[PDB]
Amino acid sequence: GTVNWSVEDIVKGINSNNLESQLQATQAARKLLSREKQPPIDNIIRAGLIPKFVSFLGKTDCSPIQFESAWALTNIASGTSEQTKAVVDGGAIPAFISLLASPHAHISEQAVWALGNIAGDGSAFRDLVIKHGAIDPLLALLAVPDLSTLACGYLRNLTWTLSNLCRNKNPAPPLDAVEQILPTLVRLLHHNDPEVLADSCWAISYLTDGPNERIEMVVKKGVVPQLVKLLGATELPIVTPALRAIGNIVTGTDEQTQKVIDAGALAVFPSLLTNPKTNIQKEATWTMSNITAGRQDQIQQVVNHGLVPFLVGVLSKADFKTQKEAAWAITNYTSGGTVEQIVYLVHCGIIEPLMNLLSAKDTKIIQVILDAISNIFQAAEKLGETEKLSIMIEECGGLDKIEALQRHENESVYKASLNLIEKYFS
């Protein structure tokens, strides 16, 4: 019927004075734009069809053509920034917002989706969608006693669109928009659908990716316990954003970090630091590095949960980027830790794998390790065991590596290595 029309036939039908011919041509356009292989987005734009689709969004007495044009425009807006911009430039944003209140759920859903693609283009279009007033009607769609009475796909699209209104930086979303969205977002974060949970966690991760004031906005809503629960989920698409959110939160103040610890997060890190997905291990070790950059009582809670052996393990064997995060976690630990915590770190076996990482061709990790080693030596000086440490570093071949660092192509590396071999191995 409407399968595989040419752009020319679509144009002919949409330019007729016949609402039904326009409906069939718009459906044919929708089908072209929904084909799996390279939809003719640019051809549809160059035909000048976006304005007509936008006008069709307003034809209340023909809900089928509203739906079909909403879908066509959704898929145009799914493309490049230029194609989304073509949709916006046609006046689509206000028409979709007006469709959010459509009594036909499939049409409102299509408007939600379209607005999500527009907002997903980036910060400018996100904020323009917000200025046109999309948040009120979007959240009104979710103002029900129990989210379970909404259709799974409807709810998933609403959540994904909201996540895009929370996404992107430079600039971040308007503070008032975030505050308006958060109560609904937290309600979705407690819903039982894995895709709703994943996109809610992503939204929260976006909101916590920034200065401490944004973190505080989120933490004040009490979502941290729920984030830790999701951190222990089986579905990787949930763990990943939950871990990202937790990592963001612990980049904030020590109080925010403590909220994460008190929620029980550290108990999940035995699994996360041994998680077979490289990205989980990396992000978990990054989160650990930011926790070991906290207070001494927080380092102490890292110790109490038994995570130092897991950092020793990561340092001993993991993808290099994870090992770099583990090196950072060790340097932070040794910069902020007590002498007893630093010796405990050594008794867990940190020295050998740290020295083994000194044979890397990356200069940052080298400097990080030398700083950690120096901090450990300073601890030994406070204990008088500097010589025992020097010996330990020598047995595992570390002295050779430091001597080689003397002839390194970096100045700070040279100064650190020379300083170590002069203050200790002399």
Binding site: T251, W286, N290, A293, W328
Partner: peptide, 5 residues
């Protein structure tokens, strides 16, 4: 300390 990616 507070690496923030």
């Amino acid at each position: 300390q507070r690496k923030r990616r």
